[PDB]
Amino acid sequence: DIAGLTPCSESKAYAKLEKKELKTLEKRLKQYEADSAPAVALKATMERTKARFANYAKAGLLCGNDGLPHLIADPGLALKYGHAGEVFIPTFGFLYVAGYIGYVGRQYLIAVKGEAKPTDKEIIIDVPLATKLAWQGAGWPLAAVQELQRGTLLEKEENITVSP
Amino acid sequence: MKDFTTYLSTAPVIATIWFTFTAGLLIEINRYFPDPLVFSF
Amino acid sequence: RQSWLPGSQIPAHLDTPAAQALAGNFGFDPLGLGKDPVALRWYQQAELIHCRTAMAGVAGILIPGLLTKAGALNVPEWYDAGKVAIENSFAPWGSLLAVQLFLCGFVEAKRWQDIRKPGSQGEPGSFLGFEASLKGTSELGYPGGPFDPLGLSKEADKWADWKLKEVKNGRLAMLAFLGFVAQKYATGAGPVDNLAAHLKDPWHVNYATNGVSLP
Amino acid sequence: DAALPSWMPGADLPGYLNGTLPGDFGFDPLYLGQDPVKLKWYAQAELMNARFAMLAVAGILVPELLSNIGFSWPGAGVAWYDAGKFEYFAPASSLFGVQMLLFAWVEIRRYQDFVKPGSANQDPIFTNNKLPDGNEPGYPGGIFDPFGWSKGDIKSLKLKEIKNGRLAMLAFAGFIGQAYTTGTTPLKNLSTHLADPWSTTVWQNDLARL
Amino acid sequence: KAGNWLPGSDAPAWLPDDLPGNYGFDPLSLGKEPASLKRFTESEVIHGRWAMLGVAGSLAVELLGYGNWYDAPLWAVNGGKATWFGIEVPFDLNALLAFEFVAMAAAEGQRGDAGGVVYPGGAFDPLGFAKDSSKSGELKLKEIKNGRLAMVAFLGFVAQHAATGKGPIAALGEHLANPWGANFATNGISVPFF
Ligand code: CLA
Ligand SMILES: CC(/C=C/C=C(C)/C=C/[C@@]12O[C@]1(C)C[C@@H](O)CC2(C)C)=C\C=C\C=C(C)\C=C\C=C(C)\C=C\[C@@]12O[C@]1(C)C[C@@H](O)CC2(C)C
Ligand SMILES: CC(/C=C/C=C(C)/C=C/[C@@]12O[C@]1(C)C[C@@H](O)CC2(C)C)=C\C=C\C=C(C)\C=C\C=C(C)\C=C\[C@@]12O[C@]1(C)C[C@@H](O)CC2(C)C
Known part of the structure; x- marks a missing residue:
């Protein structure tokens, strides 16, 4: 109960919709023998389903008027009420991987311009070079903020313009 | 076969190997971790 | 010289004379994080102070832990010793951490400026006559003066020994604390309790018999 | 690395154990004392750990030797671990x-x-x-x-001091383990090893306890 | 000079032998700059003089029987009616604290930020002993030595009261009543193990 909401372990339309889905799976399950793999598959679907509802209520996800897990994307309402795993943890779990791919792709382009013809090595990726920058870019925020302090991250007004 | 490894190191071939890597990694994780809507512990 | 892998090419930013003049230089940088020289100099200051806080920390965990399992103390486990000693106390933890960050923050922000410019706090008129002894040494991370009461600094030989003994006991203590956290999540017992469990049955009681080296 | 006496006669030498130090035979297989700033420390560190051990072994055996003979002391026959x-x-x-x-x-x-x-x-x-x-x-x-x-003749007296010392450090390190395994007075462990010397080595008392 | 404080040690070059109370005792090299040392020679005497007044007031209460030094500010809390020589003084805490803030800063500002002198020649020598001719550095040495003893002894009062909770004479009588059982080891504070 943060913004008119309720815990999904406490709401009833959530549990009503769980019983709605398991009803649809079981009336689909009835057409098969109890040994048959079209019934082994559906009972494995249920145990993935029933554990999914158990795990969403375990994490304390917020339901509402429709009985669905609602997310809270604000720190200070997720840090305070124990919901940083909804948005506030994957907003840095993403931005680690995002700037990682950016930094590896940056370092591959920076370390290819001092060559004979760098356009050839954007077709033919230097795999012993590219994987070497791939592994060693794992501390990229530790390397970027040191490059941020110099002035070597931002190229100056050598950049190309039209008519300022 | 050095010329054959250049072909394996072109742009679309590394793209179709790395995308089978990255999808195939996320497929195996989403098998052994069924339905991660929220970061649990 | 004496690399962490005897067959590896040591990266070139650990073989410069401003990097081979450094304690704990075993050629170990498989991410290249200290290729920039001031970034090496900044991370060298991060390693000295992550290790000295860990050596003080680990000696605040196992030394009152070994001297509890042997009797003559009643200090509880380190993951529960924050819960106790606040009732044998006077402030809330909020009222205690804020005075902590004031006291620690005055120190750390002076060490911050001495890293930025060595001999910062040795300028006259900073303190009340006490600022004279705060120029450090010719190399940073090793202040001396009032931080060396026994006077071990003034040798210039046996000195790289005390450097490298500090770092190696320091790096071992950082792995010890990364130990202590991990051997509290995985089994919930004490670190000396995990040492007692491994000594009474080495070949069955380890991290191969819990759910964290799972296949 | 000369015709000095050696712990293994014929073995090669480290080279820094020529003989100025009291009672050397070249025994340093871990190469601990190569640095003379450590060897000068370790020489004095050997003498103090030796001399306190010669006090220790004579301070354990003689109050037990003159108590199992039987004298009258306020502390008589009390074990050296039971004196605290x-x-x-x-x-x-x-x-x-x-x-x-x-x-x-x-x-x-x-x-x-x-x-x-x-x-x-x-x-x-x-x-x-x-x-x-x-x-x-x-x-x-x-x-x-x-x-x-x-x-x-100071060199032979220093050699006697380090040889009567190194035997005592082995004896007090004897006193620790040999009173920790069987839990007796380490003058009375000599009694069982002289009662039947062949039926109690360290091995059979280990194996009976194991 | 007149002393070495650890015989065989070299003397620090930044401690002049002319100075009263000198032994060459600065293992931290804590007064290597001359302005820092000049402030410290001012501050050691004033710490020494106030502690000699401090340790005398802590003793003469128990020598005259008025509780101890720790219990003399136990009227501002848990009651009132402060005493001195047994005589009442009808001041609460919040008035004399304001009296000793104005009047003491009025004597500090005449002392501290009006120079840097620590042996003022003139009105602070009523009878006249050190006219700075010959007997000056001898008596300045004794003011340091009795002063350094007092600063140790006051630190030996706070740590004694933090450990045992008893006053100076109240436990000096106990060390004399039990020489081997009333020292700093029988309490489980100064030595934690035995
Ligand atoms: C100082 C020499 C010394 C001597 C004379 C003894 C004598 C004895 N020990 Mg002992 N011991 C010693 C050192 C010594 N120990 C050390 C250093 C340790 C620690 C590792 C032990 C640990 C130990 C245990 C755990 C046990 C004994 C036991 C015994 C007794 C049975 C004999 C046996 O099994 O040999 C044991 C032999 C060894 C452990 C090898 C030690 C070899 C030494 C260090 C070198 C040899 C010294 C010398 C060259 C030869 C002796 C002659 C010399 C005294 C003149 C016997 C009285 C057993 C017992 O009490 O049963 C009755 C028993 O259970 N000892
Ligand atoms: C600071 C620290 C711990 C300090 C702990 C303290 C003070 C504990 C205090 C307490 O316990 C007590 C005393 C009492 C308790 O009651 C209360 C608390 C408060 C709990 C650990 C550091 C721990 C630091 C650790 C573990 C760092 C490990 C880093 C590693 C291994 C990195 C290696 C690399 O980065 C390099 C070197 C180079 C790259 O190229 C390659 C890779 C491999 C990436
Ligand atoms: C101990 C002390 C200073 C100690 C400092 C030392 C040893 C420093 C030594 C070093 O620096 C050197 C020399 C050289 C460096 O290289 C090394 C070190 C080792 C760092 C000062 C105490 C100084 C102590 C002082 C000034 C005490 C003053 C007390 C007063 C006035 C008491 C008043 C009262 O007691 C009465 C009178 C009546 C009661 O009822 C009420 C109250 C109010 C409690």
């Missing part, structure tokens, strides 16, 4: 407070001799009494030699 709980005119905390101040004199007097030899031989309040000059750290002399020894 034994009561005295004072609790053992206050005794430890006296030690940590009297030795804080003597050890710092001895350490000031180690950092500069020839600069510790003067009393504070009696400024006529002094030990004679020319001594080395670990061998003060003067009033420390009241019977008038060390006036000739």
Whole structure:
């Protein structure tokens, strides 16, 4: 109960919709023998389903008027009420991987311009070079903020313009 | 076969190997971790 | 010289004379994080102070832990010793951490400026006559003066020994604390309790018999 | 690396154990004392751990030797591990407070001799009494030699001191384990090994306990 | 000079032998700059003089029987009616604290930020002993030595009261009543183990 909401372990339309889905799976399950793999598959679907509802209520996800897990994307309402795993943890779990791919792709382009013809090595990726920058870019925020302090991250007004 | 490894190191071939890597990694994780809507512990 | 892998090419930013003049230089940088020289100099200051806080920390965990399992103390486990000693106390933890960050923050922000410019706090008129002894040494991370009461600094030989003994006991203590956290999540017992469990049955009681080296 | 006596006769030598130190035979297989700033420390570290052990083994055996003969002491027959709980005119905390101040004199007097030899031989309040000059750290002399020894043949007496010392450090390290496994007085472990020497080695007492 | 504090040690070059109370005792090299040392020679005497007044007031209360030094500010809390020589003084805490803030800063500002002198020649020598001719550095040495003893002894009052909770004479009588059982080791504070 943060913004008119309720815990999904406490709401009833959530549990009503769980019983709605398991009803649809079981009336689909009835057409098969109890040994048959079209019934082994559906009972494995249920145990993935029933554990999914158990795990969403375990994490304390917020339901509402429709009985669905609602997310809270604000720190200070997720840090305070124990919901940083909804948005506030994957907003840095993403931005680690995002700037990682950016930094590896940056370092591959920076370390290819001092060559004979760098356009050839954007077709033919230097795999012993590219994987070497791939592994060693794992501390990229530790390397970027040191490059941020110099002035070597931002190229100056050598950049190309039209008519300022 | 050095010329054959250049072909394996072109742009679309590394793209179709790395995308089978990255999808195939996320497929195996989403098998052994069924339905991660929220970061649990 | 004496690399962490005897067959590896040591990266070139650990073989410069401003990097081979450094304690704990075993050629170990498989991410290249200290290729920039001031970034090496900044991370060298991060390693000295992550290790000295860990050596003080680990000696605040196992030394009152070994001297509890042997009797003559009643200090509880380190993951529960924050819960106790606040009732044998006077402030809330909020009222205690804020005075902590004031006291620690005055120190750390002076060490911050001495890293930025060595001999910062040795300028006259900073303190009340006490600022004279705060120029450090010719190399940073090793202040001396009032931080060396026994006077071990003034040798210039046996000195790289005390450097490298500090770092190696320091790096071992950082792995010890990364130990202590991990051997509290995985089994919930004490670190000396995990040492007692491994000594009474080495070949069955380890991290191969819990759910964290799972296949 | 000469015709010095050796711990393994014919073995190669480290080269820095020529013979100036008291009673060397080249035994340093871990190469611990290559640095002379560590070897000078380890030489004095050997003598102090030796001399306190010769006090220890003579301080354990002789109160047990003259008690199993049977004399009358206030502490008679009490074990050396059972002498800590034994009561005295004072609790053992206050005794430890006296030690940590009297030795804080003597050890710092001895350490000031180690950092500069020839600069510790003067009393504070009696400024006529002094030990004679020319001594080395670990061998003060003067009033420390009241019977008038060390006036000739000092090398063999230092060799006797380190050999009677190294036997004692092995004996006190004997006293630790051999009173921890079987839990008896280590003069009375000699009684079982002289009762039936063939039916109690270290192996059969290990294997019976295992 | 007149002393070495650890015989055989070299003397620090930044401690002049002319200075009263000198032994060459600065293992931290804590006064290597001359302005820092000049402030410290001012501050050691004033710490020494206030502690000699401090340790005398802590003793003469128990020598005259008025509780101890720790219990003399136990009227501002848990009651009132402060005493001195047994005589009442009808001041609460919040008035004399304001009196000793104005009047003491009025004597500090005449002392501290009006120079840097620590042996003022003139009105602070009523009878006249040190006319700075010959007997000055001798009596300045004694003011340091009795002063350094007082700063140790006051630190030996706070740590004694933090450990045992008893006053100076109240436990000096106990060390004389039990020489081996009333020292700093029988309490489980100064030595934690035995
Ligand atoms: C100082 C020499 C010394 C001597 C004379 C003894 C003598 C004895 N020990 Mg002992 N011991 C010693 C050192 C010594 N130990 C050390 C250093 C340790 C620690 C590792 C032990 C640990 C130990 C245990 C755990 C046990 C004994 C036992 C015994 C007794 C049975 C004999 C046996 O099994 O040999 C044991 C032999 C060894 C452990 C090898 C030690 C070899 C030494 C260090 C070198 C040899 C010294 C010398 C060259 C030869 C002796 C002659 C010399 C004394 C003149 C016997 C009385 C057993 C017992 O009490 O049963 C009755 C038993 O259970 N000892
Ligand atoms: C600071 C620290 C711990 C300090 C702990 C303290 C003070 C504990 C205090 C307490 O316990 C007590 C005393 C009492 C308790 O009651 C209360 C608390 C408060 C709990 C650990 C550091 C721990 C630091 C650790 C573990 C760092 C490990 C880093 C590693 C291994 C990195 C290696 C690399 O980065 C390099 C070197 C180079 C790259 O190229 C390659 C890779 C491999 C990436
Ligand atoms: C101990 C002390 C200073 C100690 C400092 C030392 C040893 C420093 C030594 C070193 O720096 C050197 C020399 C050289 C460096 O290289 C090394 C070190 C080792 C760092 C000052 C105490 C100084 C102590 C002082 C000034 C005490 C003053 C007390 C007063 C006035 C008491 C008043 C009262 O007691 C009465 C009178 C009546 C009661 O009822 C009420 C109250 C109010 C409690």
